[PDB]
């Protein structure tokens, strides 16, 4: 993985990592530097990770059955409830005040908006050197999932190093390891990830959607005749994007909002929860349908889109929750929905794991056909708490059951985890554009996208009597972290 | 003219500074930070300056007359010599030294690399007042080191982003350029295609006059070692530049697009990096430098100012340069018709541009002589007294740079642009220059190389740059933080 930096070398290019920043500059993948404005490159891999074909495809075909399983579990709320109110009971200020509100808004008889968008991400990594995938899953998260945007960008800066490679490579010269990536044509591509564009227009089609479930034309209709005696509705709805009260990953949402924006023609705003204590009200029209949401006495909502709300600290007041419930209670198609979010809490990614109570009959509805194909995937996991056999889980060989803890300090003695040595490899890695870091123990991690938009179970809502509207993988990302400290981003070269 | 900010006022436009600083970042339309690495979005307008058709098109087909015009006068060495000197006689550490070289390398009796490279930039006004004269009148000619062929076609995109959301932000609520309509287009420039282009042609010209592989056979026949497999562009790059997008969005094509090498060198590092090697004494001699690069092109993004020069180290490396095959952008006598005297010497026709720029094609001086804003002569070589009687006649119209000009007064508009984070509105204050880049690439005078028996190989307009700035600003462009990018919109 150092071959770039070794070519880049002694091929007597000494100016290269100037180029990269002014590369960097170029496709807009940067970060705002500490003081001030004034923004300089994001982290990047000099080289991309190499997958096969096959392997490729693999992940990208079971992004619906991720999509699918999340849909189906989120939606199944006796089940979320009973399924983690020992989590809440632990963490009351957070994971409690959440699972609250899934009661009060899904739970109680109060009516609610039951289109939910997912734009997820599953996160293998593979298994270093049974007829399972070496591309064991990590990591499931439904919220705020980061670098949709940016993501292909990534593939134009790698394809910048190949065309730099190439000339500079001729120039001696000698193509004659060819590590193909680097020419082009046939056995290995560098696969550009599809989620610049699959994602503003799930968020374009949720709207849409929503528009059209209100008949928000007939909703300004009525609202109107109301005021025909204080502030109009606008004439379409839009997005609302939840932000931190200290943001970041900007370039990000915005290479996704002014999607949205340009080619979708649909605005964006951006809110704290915060701000929405003020900003937010809902208004009912109907008594028996969810309100709906304006923002300034105006902002129609279509579709609430968290960039926040994911870790504790995002809220800091009873407001917060206020504005975060206010959202939930309202008829705006939310990204996550809290169902959605809470789906995103290890406590299920484990739960998952239980291919027989969880995983065939709760997310799947029985079809342990599409269920089977998931498990390919899985690293077993067994809980800690109460029922009889978390003892004989205990007494079960050989020093392979997780910082986290393994080895002679996890002996000394939360939850078990089957063990899997996971692929590690040294790479060449560029850091605020002018400092080449060469990474050690790098494992890659491999993150496919979803979006889905679906209806409540047993709906007709969208077509083939389905009740989901569209669910589909949405391109990847790739991210370099050392195993044991901030990522670079990186992306596919896929060989056959 | 106002519209913008009042309908983003109006419409209840929210966090928009950000947005638009957001879509530079995205665009790659920036500039470096005085303190090292960060890069922040450059100045640029938040709407387009408008020109008819005709007039648009009038400017680019003048293009071709001011490389040809600029072609010229450069290449009649000695015509060059005797309009500089008093002008150099005034200031030696610089003109001196420049005015020396094209004595050096051209005038006594040596090679020199005869193929030219210019990447020029007409920039033009608008007086704000029959068709006997253009209403567009230039204002500079640029031969060395124009800036934005770059970054101009971006700040098209980044208007159609304003516009886009400006339809959007309009239909929200009830409810001209913003609209495609067809009878006002945004125009985006050609120059960040049509210079790398010219770039990479010119380093092909160069490979073919050299006949490199036949000299790279050559070297290994006659310490010297393994030579590249092909020329480089050399780009000469001043000693702390905040403009690199401009200069990489460029080369940037010329490697992905044109499969041709680039390296950045100051003069300093030249100093080092480059020597000069004689095959025959009747071809000037090849430059290497790091040993393995072979020079073909020395495309020059610095040198047009002293500050540039600290060194005597400094001037030996562009002599180094100079004396080399490696095909000049600009070439010395090149550089030279930068300077304001050329420019005002242009201006008289029977004189000068008739039988020197145009070699006594009447009929094209009177072309570009339609834009020109009349420069006489007083501190004069000849009597020099009937237009000093002349003028106070209609005595209240008449400037000076020491050199009698005529007063035009040039069209303000009203605008808003966005620089250093904040939105400025410009009310009946802010006037536009309209630069029209140009690229050229020709021989000796005489010399059949080139189309159509002509010493030239091409000529073409390469499309365009707009900048903006306060009427009441102080002297010059967006390098001194003054000026902001623009852009045309064209209206039937
Ligand atoms: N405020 C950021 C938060 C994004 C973020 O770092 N979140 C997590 C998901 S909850 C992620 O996918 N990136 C970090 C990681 O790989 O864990 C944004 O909206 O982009
Ligand atoms: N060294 C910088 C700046 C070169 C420069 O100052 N160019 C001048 C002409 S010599 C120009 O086009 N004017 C800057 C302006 O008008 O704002 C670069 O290569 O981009």
């Not at 999340?70 to 957070?94: G, M, P």
């Not at 049974?130 to 999932?145: G, H, P």
């Amino acid at each position: 993985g150092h071959m770039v930096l070794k070519l880049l070398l002694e091929l007597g290019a000494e100016r290269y990592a100037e180029q990269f920043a002014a590369k960097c500059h170029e496709l807009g993948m940067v970060m705002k530097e500490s003081a001030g404005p004034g923004r300089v490159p994001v982290p990047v891999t000099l080289q991309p990770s190499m997958i096969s074909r096959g392997e490729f495809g693999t992940l990208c075909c079971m992004q619906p059955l991720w999509n699918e399983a999340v849909d189906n579990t989120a939606r199944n709320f006796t089940f979320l409830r009973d399924a983690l109110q020992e989590t809440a009971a632990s963490d009351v200020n957070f994971t409690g005040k959440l699972l609250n509100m899934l009661q009060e808004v899904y739970l109680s008889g109060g009516p609610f908006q039951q289109l939910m968008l997912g734009i997820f991400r599953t996160d293998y990594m593979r298994e270093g050197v049974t007829t399972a995938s070496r591309w064991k899953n990590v990591e499931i998260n439904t919220i705020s999932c980061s670098f949709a945007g940016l993501s292909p960008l990534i593939t134009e800066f790698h394809q910048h190093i190949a065309a730099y490679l190439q000339v500079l490579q001729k120039a001696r010269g000698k193509e004659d390891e060819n590590m193909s990536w680097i020419w082009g044509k046939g056995n290995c591509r560098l696969e550009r990830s599809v989620s610049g564009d699959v994602v503003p227009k799930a968020i374009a089609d949720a709207v849409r959607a929503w528009v059209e479930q209100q008949k928000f034309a007939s909703l300004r209709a009525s609202w109107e005749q109301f005021q025909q005696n204080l502030g109009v509705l606008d004439t379409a709805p839009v997005v609302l994007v939840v932000v931190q009260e200290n943001e970041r990953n900007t370039a990000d949402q915005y290479a996704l909002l002014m999607r949205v924006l340009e080619e979708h023609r649909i605005r964006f705003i951006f809110r704290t929860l915060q701000e929405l204590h003020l900003s937010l009200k809902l208004h009912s029209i109907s008594p028996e349908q969810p309100p709906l949401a304006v923002v300034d006495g105006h902002y129609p909502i279509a579709v609430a889109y968290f960039r926040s709300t994911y870790v504790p600290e995002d809220f800091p007041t009873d407001a917060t929750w206020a504005a975060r419930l206010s959202l939930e209670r309202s008829s705006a198609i939310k990204c996550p929905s809290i169902p959605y979010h809470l789906l995103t809490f290890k406590k299920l990614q484990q739960l998952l794991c239980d291919v027989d109570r969880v995983l065939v009959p709760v997310a799947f509805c029985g079809d342990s056909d599409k269920a089977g194909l998931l498990q390919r995937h899985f690293v077993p996991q067994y809980s800690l708490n109460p029922k009889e056999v978390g003892e004989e889980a205990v007494e079960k060989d050989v020093l392979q059951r997780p910082l986290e803890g393994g080895g002679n300090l996890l002996s000394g003695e939360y939850v078990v985890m089957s063990r899997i040595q996971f692929h590690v490899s040294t790479g060449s890695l560029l850091a605020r554009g002018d400092v080449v870091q060469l990474e050690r123990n790098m494992c890659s991690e491999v993150g496919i996208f979803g979006v889905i938009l679906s209806a409540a179970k047993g709906s007709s809502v969208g077509t083939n009597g389905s009740s989901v509207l569209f669910n589909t993988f949405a391109g990847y990302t790739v991210r370099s972290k050392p195993a044991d400290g901030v990522a670079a981003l990186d992306s596919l070269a896929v060989v056959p």
